[PDB]
Structures are given as structure tokens and as C-alpha cells.
From a paper:
In contrast, one RBD binder (7A9) did not bin with any of the other candidates or benchmark antibodies tested, indicating a novel epitope. To characterize the 7A9 epitope, we again used HDX-MS, which indicated that the major binding site of 7A9 is partially occluded by the NTD and spans residues 353–364 of the spike protein. To further analyze this rare antigenic site, we used X-ray crystallography to determine the structure of 7A9 bound to the CoV-2 RBD. The structure reveals that the third complementarity-determining region (CDR3) of 7A9 forms a platform through which the VHH binds to a concave cleft on the RBD, inserting Leu107 into a small cleft formed by Tyr396 and Phe464. CDR1 and CDR2 contribute only minimally to the interaction, with Arg31 of CDR1 forming a network of Van der Waals interactions and Tyr60 of CDR2 forming a hydrogen bond with Glu465. The energetic driver of the interaction is likely the salt bridges formed between Arg357 of the RBD and two 7A9 glutamates in CDR3, Glu104 and Glu119. The structure helps to rationalize how 7A9 is still able to bind and neutralize the Omicron variant, as the epitope does not overlap with any of the 15 RBD mutations in this VOC. Notably, the 7A9 epitope is fully occluded in the closed state and partially occluded in the open state of the spike protein. Modeling 7A9 binding onto the full CoV-2 spike protein indicates that the VHH would introduce a clash with the NTD from the neighboring spike protomer in either the closed- or open state. Consistent with the AUC-SV experiments, we observed dissociation of the spike trimer upon binding to 7A9, but not 1E4, with calculated masses of the complexes being comparable to AUC-SV experiments. Together, these data clearly indicate that the binding of 7A9 to its cryptic epitope results in the complete dissociation of the SARS-CoV-2 spike trimer, whereas the spike trimer remains intact upon 1E4 binding.
As all coronaviruses use spike proteins on the viral surface to enter the host cells, and these spike proteins share sequence and structural homology, we set out to discover cross-reactive biologic agents targeting the spike protein to block viral entry. Through llama immunization campaigns, we have identified single domain antibodies (VHHs) that are cross-reactive against multiple emergent coronaviruses (SARS-CoV, SARS-CoV-2, and MERS). While the vast majority of antibodies targeting the SARS-CoV-2 spike protein have been conventional immunoglobulins, several potent heavy-chain variable domains (VHHs) from camelid-derived single-domain antibodies (sdAbs) targeting the CoV-2 spike have also been reported. In this work, we report the discovery of multiple VHHs that bind distinct cross-reactive epitopes on the spike protein.
Numbering used by the authors:
A (entry chain B): 1 to 131, 135
B (entry chain A): 333 to 527
């Protein structure tokens, strides 16, 4: 029902910046929390950031972050386009992974955090960080 | 307990031609990368997905060491996402590359008065190499619309070209020995760790 397509990955020097986009096709996306996960080689998928669904009559937005990316990374949601962004500053080599976009129907301002708690997934975009 | 045979790779007498690059898989050993990052000999030591300083702290299932010789201008092609004769036709790194590219000027070893013609590179190919794919074939390349019948001629080229390393070459055209270390991390017991 929900199709997710990531974009914006690539190679970047340690300390540089990157901005990922994920667009969601489907009406179910508006009533879905959306988030970012990443998967380094040989590791399981782990939470990066999440943002609450669209809620009628309120402008309040709930988000959630993995602690090791607080401040460096920012998740944002576009108004009435159902696209989410992950602004990635101060990148470290250990940030290298495939970055996945995810969407999950939910109620209220809940932001899920486990990968098994999101139904819909993108294909992933590769982020590689180099260091001299 | 036994140390990883990184000396066999970095200090090998002869290096492979880039079109026929060499690979050694390293496992079940203790890796001291400090000999590498501390040394001042290397002119390139760029890592991807790892910090060079923390290499002794990491553990991997396997470490791969690919080694060959290219000229100085082409060391840059040894990086993910690169394009060019070396990256497209000789040695290609994947986009999800985790490892380090190490290179150093070898003019005193791999050039000779009159020219060293033992080091070759592939100059044409019908399509790009896949990541870590190797092509050691030697068939005449058809650059035009007319068949070559296996012999050189107009628009029909021998696919391998010689580097012709002379000691007086500009530094861009001097031989550089390259070692690419790939760190493979899997859902499996790590067998290469630091001290
Ligand atoms: C590659 O070899 C260098 C130099 O090797 C030296 O000379 C050889 C002929 C042989 O006698 C070696 O045993 C010699 O060490 C190594 O650099 C040396 O490393 C040791 C230990 O770190 C250090 O004490 C020496 O001072 C170094 N010498 C120089 C000139 O730098 C290098 O470690 C070898 N590379 C690898 C990956 O093992």
C-alpha cells in the first residue's frame, strides 16, 4: 500500500554533510509514522530517527532519535507531500551503512523505534564516509 | 597468536600488473595495523567506513589484500564511485567499500633505465568490470564496425598497454605500488583482531 523510495546517498569525507530524501506513495502514508534506519555490513538494522504521523487539527510534531546521532542528524517531514528528510551533519566513518526509509500506520503521536515495528520499507541508499 | 602476514603483501619483491591484480585473503590471525598507519612511507592512506586510528580495536571475519602497480595519476581511481581506464577496465571497488587504500611511490623499484615494460594495464573493454572482477584475457579489441579476425590493425587494438616506467618520468607517470585492504564483517565469528 505504501511505496518508499530513498535518495541522496553517496561518498563523503569525515566531517561533511549529506541530506537523504524519502517519498511515500499511497494515502496510507499520511496516517503513518515515518523513520530512518541504517544497516552497517554484518549488522542488524538499527533505528536512526523517527517522526510522528500527520494529525488533523494540530501542528505539533513528535520525533525520536538514536542517541549517537542527536544534534548531528535531523529528521523532518514535508507538509502535504508525505516526504521525509534526514539532514546528516558531522559525519563519521562509523556512520557508513545502507540507510533505509520506513513507514508504519499508528495512532496519535507515537513514534516506533524497532525495525519489527515498521511494516513498510524502502530499498535503501548507501552512505559511505571516508577518512584520510 | 600468530601475526597476520601483512609483510608478505606490502614487502613482496614483485607486484602484479593491475589488469592481473593479486588478492590474498587473511584470516585467523592477529593484525597490528600500527606498523602501517605509523609509517611515513605511504603517500596515500585513505580508509572508508573505518577510522585508520581505531583499526587495532576492530574485529573482522576476513581481511583481503589486493595489490598491483599503477602510475601516480591513477591512484585516485582506486576509490568507490570512480571512473576511468583503471576503475572501469582493471580494478573496481564497490560502492559499499569498507577498507583502506594504501599507495607509495615505487620509482626506485619498478622503473628501469630504458623503461620497465613488465607492468601492463587494460586500455579497452566491451563493458565495465563488476566490483572486484578480474579480466586477464588478451583478445584483440574491436574499436570500429569491422571485424578484427584476431589480428591488430585499423580500429583493432591489442587490449593491454605497457606503462613504460622510466626513472626520469614526471611523478604523475611514475610507478606506485598499491595495497587495497578490504575488511569483511559478517554474522560469523571474527578471525582477524588487533593485539
Ligand atoms: C616492510 O619492511 C619494512 C622494512 O623492513 C626492514 O628491512 C627488511 C630488509 C627486513 O630486514 C625487515 O626485517 C626490516 O624491518 C618494515 O619497516 C620496519 O618495521 C619495523 C617494525 O615496525 C621497524 O622497527 C623498522 O624500523 C622499520 N624499518 C623501516 C625502514 O621503516 C615494515 O614494517 C614492513 N611492512 C610490513 C607490513 O611488515
Amino acid at each position: 500500500q505504501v511505496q518508499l523510495v530513498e535518495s541522496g546517498g553517496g561518498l563523503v569525507q569525515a566531517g561533511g554533510s549529506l541530506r537523504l530524501s524519502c517519498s511515500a506513495s499511497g494515502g496510507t502514508a499520511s496516517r503513518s509514522a515515518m523513520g530512518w534506519f541504517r544497516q552497517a555490513p554484518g549488522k542488524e538494522r538499527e533505528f536512526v530517527a523517527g517522526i510522528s504521523r500527520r494529525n488533523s487539527g494540530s501542528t505539533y510534531v513528535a520525533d525520536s532519535y538514536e542517541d549517537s546521532v542527536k544534534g548531528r542528524f535531523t529528521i523532518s517531514r514535508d507538509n502535504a507531500k508525505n516526504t521525509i528528510y534526514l539532514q546528516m551533519n558531522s559525519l563519521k566513518p562509523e556512520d557508513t551503512a545502507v540507510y533505509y526509509c520506513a513507514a508504519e500506520p499508528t495512532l496519535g503521536w507515537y513514534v516506533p523505534r524497532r525495525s519489527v515495528e515498521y511494516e513498510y520499507w524502502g530499498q535503501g541508499t548507501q552512505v559511505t564516509v571516508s577518512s584520510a | 597468536t600468530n601475526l597476520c602476514p601483512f609483510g608478505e603483501v606490502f614487502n613482496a619483491t614483485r607486484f602484479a600488473s593491475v589488469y592481473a591484480w593479486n588478492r590474498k585473503r587473511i584470516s585467523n590471525c592477529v593484525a597490528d595495523y600500527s606498523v602501517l598507519y605509523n609509517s611515513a612511507s605511504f603517500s596515500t592512506f585513505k580508509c572508508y567506513g573505518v577510522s585508520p586510528t581505531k583499526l587495532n580495536d576492530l574485529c573482522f571475519t576476513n581481511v583481503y589484500a589486493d595489490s598491483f602497480v599503477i602510475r601516480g595519476d591513477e591512484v585516485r581511481q582506486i576509490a568507490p564511485g570512480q571512473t576511468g581506464k583503471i576503475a572501469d577496465y582493471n580494478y573496481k571497488l564497490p560502492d559499499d567499500f569498507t577498507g583502506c587504500v594504501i599507495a607509495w611511490n615505487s620509482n626506485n623499484l619498478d622503473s628501469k633505465v630504458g623503461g620497465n615494460y613488465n607492468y601492463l594495464y587494460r586500455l579497452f573493454r566491451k563493458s565495465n568490470l563488476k566490483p572486484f572482477e578480474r579480466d586477464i584475457s588478451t583478445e584483440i579489441y574491436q574499436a570500429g564496425s569491422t571485424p578484427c579476425n584476431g589480428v591488430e590493425g585499423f580500429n583493432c587494438y591489442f587490449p593491454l598497454q605497457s606503462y613504460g616506467f622510466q626513472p626520469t618520468n614526471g611523478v604523475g607517470y611514475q610507478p606506485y605500488r598499491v595495497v587495497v585492504l578490504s575488511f569483511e564483517l559478517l554474522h560469523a565469528p571474527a578471525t582477524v583482531c588487533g593485539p
